[PDB]
DNA sequence: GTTCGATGTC
DNA sequence: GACACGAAC
């Protein structure tokens, strides 16, 4: 992975050091940042870039190489300046996931990292160090994915970059070729307090930012590119999940388990439904995605939710609310189920509706745009329906 | 109990 | 680019 150039010349566009500052290049291998800093502001700084990879550190005489785990690196000395595209990858068994480091190792990142929950990810580990590694004042220009501002793996780092510091973010979107990422440049500054929210057009020097909202009392809330028409839906209605129990369907291992389940169908069997079975307004209850099948009664062992019709909303189709009422209450194993809390009187068919609507898919995007590839939780409790009463 | 993807597929 | 699962905690 190569950081285009114009990715790396509006990120050094966004650097500052004082002369003679210490300038680092995390994840470096041939220290493209460094180089470019250097041509942008010339001879006097000192440079550092630090390599897990022997193999890959390639640097000039003018910058000091380290070979080293950036995440476990104890310099003598902070820095004023730290920039580069640091590596993105949950840490886990290789079936799975990208990142393969031994556990003792794992465990140290852990230990590390106050802001480590959930999976997490390199670049949320790489993000923390940095900023543990600047001097007061000292400046952090990272592009990273968009992922951490809205995702809740991602909360104690927001709230951990809120009160180290004054952030930046900078939108770019799907910037790297033939890579489904979304990305942000992030500039931290250690000092002073509050967001402000960038978007940017391309541009012949790269990109171009643009000021699309400040947040000066910023504690580490979820980021949204806001605009007066979605801030105005959330202040006409009230959230969603003021009136739902949102639940998750069980997990594929789950159903593998239960003694009832089967790879194939046969009497009495029906599928056991995925993301793929939900569409806008209705369920194909008829074609299996699964691989799975089941007695629709016996559904409820694995959710008690899974007795009775309810409403299911969409996870894994982007940046969109598509919703269905369940008329049949068959098993899932994907999606976000919907119990109508204590008191609540709800018309199903009417707000299906609603979720499903041109306006709604509008608000979302807007909001969210492409960070991730899903409607999240976070998101989807948010969602502006009718005020009820009490 | 539920989260996440330098996801993958075509 | 439309449309999408189990290791990890
Ligand atoms: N900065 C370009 C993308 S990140 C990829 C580079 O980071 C290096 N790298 C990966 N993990 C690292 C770590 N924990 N510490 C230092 N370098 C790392 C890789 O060897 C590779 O050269």
Redesign the pocket.
């Known amino acids: ?1 190569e ?1 285009p150039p114009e990715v790396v010349d509006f990120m050094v566009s966004l650097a500052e050091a004082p002369r003679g500052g210490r300038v680092l290049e995390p994840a470096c291998a041939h220290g493209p940042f460094l180089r470019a800093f250097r041509e942008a502001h010339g001879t006097a700084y000192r440079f550092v870039g630090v390599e897990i990879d022997p193999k890959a550190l390639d640097l000039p005489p003018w910058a000091e190489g380290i070979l080293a785990d950036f995440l476990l690196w104890e310099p003598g000395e902070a820095f004023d300046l730290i920039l580069g ?9 290789a ?4 990142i393969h480091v031994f556990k003792a190792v ?1 465990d140290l990142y ?1 230990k590390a990292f106050s802001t480590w929950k ?2 997490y ?1 390199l670049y949320g580990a790489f993000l923390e160090k940095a900023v543990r590694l600047l001097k007061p004042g000292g400046v952090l220009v990272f ?1 990273v ?1 968009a ?1 951490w501002l809205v ?4 909360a104690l780092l927001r709230e951990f970059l809120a009160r180290e510091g004054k952030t930046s973010v900078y939108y770019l979107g799907e910037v ?1 070729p ?4 979304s ?1 942000v440049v992030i500039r931290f500054q250690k000092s002073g307090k509050g967001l402000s929210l960038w978007d940017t057009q391309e541009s012949e020097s790269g990109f171009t930012p643009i000021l699309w909202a400040e947040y000066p009392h910023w504690e580490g809330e979820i980021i949204r590119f806001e605009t007066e028409e979605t801030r105005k839906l959330e202040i006409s209605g009230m959230p969603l999940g003021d009136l739902f129990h ?9 159903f ?1 388990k239960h003694p009832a389940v089967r790879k194939e169908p046969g009497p009495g069997l029906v599928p056991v439904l ?3 079975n ?1 569409k806008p307004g209705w369920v194909d209850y008829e074609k299996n ?2 691989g799975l099948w089941m007695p629709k009664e016996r559904a409820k062992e694995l ?1 008690d939710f899974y007795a009775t019709p309810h409403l299911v909303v ?5 940046t969109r609310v ?1 919703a269905a009422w369940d008329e049949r209450a068959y098993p899932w194993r ?1 999606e976000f189920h919907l119990l109508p809390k204590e008191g609540v009187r709800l018309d199903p068919s009417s707000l299906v509706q609603w979720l499903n609507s041109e306006a709604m898919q509008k608000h979302v995007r807007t909001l969210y745009r492409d960070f ?3 409607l ?2 976070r998101m989807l409790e948010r969602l502006p329906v009718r005020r009820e009463y009490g």
């Open positions: 992975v950081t595209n640091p590596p993105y990858g949950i840490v886990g068994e079936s799975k996931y990208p794992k852990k959930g999976k990810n592009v994915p992922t995702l809740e793996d991602f790297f033939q890579k489904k990422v990305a949102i639940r998750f369907a069980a997990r594929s291992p789950e593998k995925t993301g793929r939900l995605h699964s959710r969409a996870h894994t189709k982007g598509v994907e991730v590839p899903h999240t939780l």
